[PDB]
Amino acid sequence: STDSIVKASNWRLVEVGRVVLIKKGQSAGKLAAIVEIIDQKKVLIDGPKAGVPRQAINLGQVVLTPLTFALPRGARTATVSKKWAAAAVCEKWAASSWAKKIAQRERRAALTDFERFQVMVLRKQKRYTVKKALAKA
Template identity: 55%
Template sequence: MSQTEVVSSQWPQVETGRVVLINDGKDEGKLAAVVQIIDHKRILVDSPHIERQAVQLSHVSLTSQVVTKLPRAARSGVVEKYWKEANVDDKAASSTWHKKRASREKKRALTDFERFKVMVLKKQRRFEVRKAVAKARKSS
């Protein structure tokens, strides 16, 4: 599993410093670090990309990445320092789920004509692949 892949069973891995992906609200799609556990359903998160806030665990996905040695209830400046030391943004940008998410967003932003062009290119690729397979099959 890559450094920032999303972990399926969430609650046992909740800890200070755990990097989470926010799935709901105005900061949807952004990463943050758990600063403090409020109760069994809510956590306090902070990062250089969002403002410090309490979120429900049901509105976040935990990643396998942890900002190590982050003190509990650290202020925003401290969180930003540890965030940069851990290279969270670089590791997240190189992860497969981040690339897949960016691809999905790109597809959603296509216009009708752009979707048509993609369909035509897929048909052309499929035709070439089938032609190559048939040629290989015939020669063997």
């Protein structure tokens, strides 16, 4: 029929194979992969290359990531460790700007006092050129 316009929501939806970011607990900050949905609050995860075990964690402690890779429901650790590489998950994750800023706010917290001093003497130069790039009214 004719044209129809709808703009409501495009969500990150929990399904089998979705990559999550474990934010709380033992495996903090590492990646995972949902393999089977238990209920609307609890799921089953596994990420081998990130090194986490195959837990049954509830969704209050993971964050859903915008990327997904296909695996059948209820796969084992020997299966998810294959599709993690056959769908190339970790190098897709570094390309996102999310994992850039996670590495960035980690690097900023790991500087000692010398490269807390090296930043300011080089930000004097980066401030110097933007008054010569925007050198106008």
